[PDB]
Design a protein around this ligand. Structure first.
Ligand SMILES: O=C(O)CS[C@@H]1Cc2cc(Cl)ccc2Sc2ccccc21
Length: 133
């Protein structure tokens, strides 16, 4: 019952500062423009200890399956090859991606009926709000 309140199908409804986040991460111009238009559907499921997060959009589909605290390989929407670890910290899912000596952290939290996604790269934060689909 670890992630119960995250489970479901979610749709992006708002974004703030995401272009600046992507610039800070090192995403190139054309990818930033196209990826930044996308309104992904995020589908979160749990089967035993394995959590799966899928994102489906016009631009790209992504999928990760993982066990909390156990590092894994991930290919991001912008095609970085990263080493990721996802943990639960006080009810917040904390996702750290490491690549090329860099790091970024994505936090996912339930707030009212929304799922709020905060993406941090150095001094730049972006907030993405999802609602139930
Ligand atoms: O989950 C969130 O909203 C924030 S991470 C984000 C997810 C994403 C997923 C799809 Cl399928 C299509 C475009 C994008 S935009 C994008 C571009 C670069 C790096 C990550 C992401």
């Amino acid at each position: 019952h670890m992630c119960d309140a995250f489970v479901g199908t979610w749709k992006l409804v708002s974004s703030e500062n995401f272009d600046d986040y992507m610039k800070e991460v090192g995403v190139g111009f054309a990818t930033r423009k196209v990826a930044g238009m996308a309104k992904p559907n995020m589908i979160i499921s749990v089967n035993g200890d394995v959590i799966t997060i899928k994102s489906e959009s016009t631009f790209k589909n992504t999928e990760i399956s993982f066990i909390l605290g156990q590092e894994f390989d991930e290919v991001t929407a912008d095609d970085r090859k990263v080493k990721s670890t996802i943990t639960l910290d006080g009810g917040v899912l904390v996702h750290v991606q490491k690549w090329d000596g860099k790091s970024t952290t994505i936090k996912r939290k339930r707030e009212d009926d929304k799922l709020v996604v905060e993406c941090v790269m150095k001094g730049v934060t972006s907030t993405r709000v999802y609602e139930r689909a």
